[PDB]
Design a protein around this ligand. Structure first.
Ligand code: CA
Ligand code: CA
Length: 156
């Protein structure tokens, strides 16, 4: 129950898999696809890419990013990323997933973001809990993107 703050924001959705291997402390995130993204270019669509942050206690510990897909609101990525998180800390971290529009000049604006892990709620918490309940098993799930203002207030 609960969560769902981004549902009516109409920013789009992201699908990714999570896998956690406790013995090795290996956390794998595969960015699969996004859909229904907000348009971010005047006269056009968006040039989306995805950033992943590992966080704890308001600090960005590690940063990864996908390739950029041009001129689409429904990008497919299928790009894998791994992090090292010891089992004693896996219930105390966040994985933050942000979709942004690439612009050749100017700060790349976020479309929206979500996080899973500590302090996550709703479908975000469910995905994380499913990951932890099933060591070594990759679990794919869709998430609704939420405005950065809101998500960042929860992460800070
Ligand atoms: Ca733009
Ligand atoms: Ca752009």
């Amino acid at each position: 129950s609960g969560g769902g703050g981004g549902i009516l924001e109409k920013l789009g959705d992201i699908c990714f898999s999570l896998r956690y291997v406790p013995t090795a402390g290996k956390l794998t995130v595969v960015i699969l696809e996004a859909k229904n993204l907000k348009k971010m270019d005047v006269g056009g669509l968006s040039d989306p890419y995805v950033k992943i942050h590992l966080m704890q206690n308001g600090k960005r510990l590690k940063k990864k990013k996908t390739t950029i897909k041009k001129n689409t609101l429904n990008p497919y990525y299928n790009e894998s990323f791994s992090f090292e998180v010891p089992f004693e800390q896996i219930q105390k971290v966040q994985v933050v997933v942000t979709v942004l529009d690439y612009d050749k000049i100017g700060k790349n604006d976020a479309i929206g973001k979500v996080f899973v892990g500590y302090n996550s709620t709703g479908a975000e918490l469910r995905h994380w809990s499913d990951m932890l309940a099933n060591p070594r098993r990759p679990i794919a799930q869709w998430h609704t993107l939420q405005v950065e203002e809101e998500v960042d207030a929860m992460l800070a």
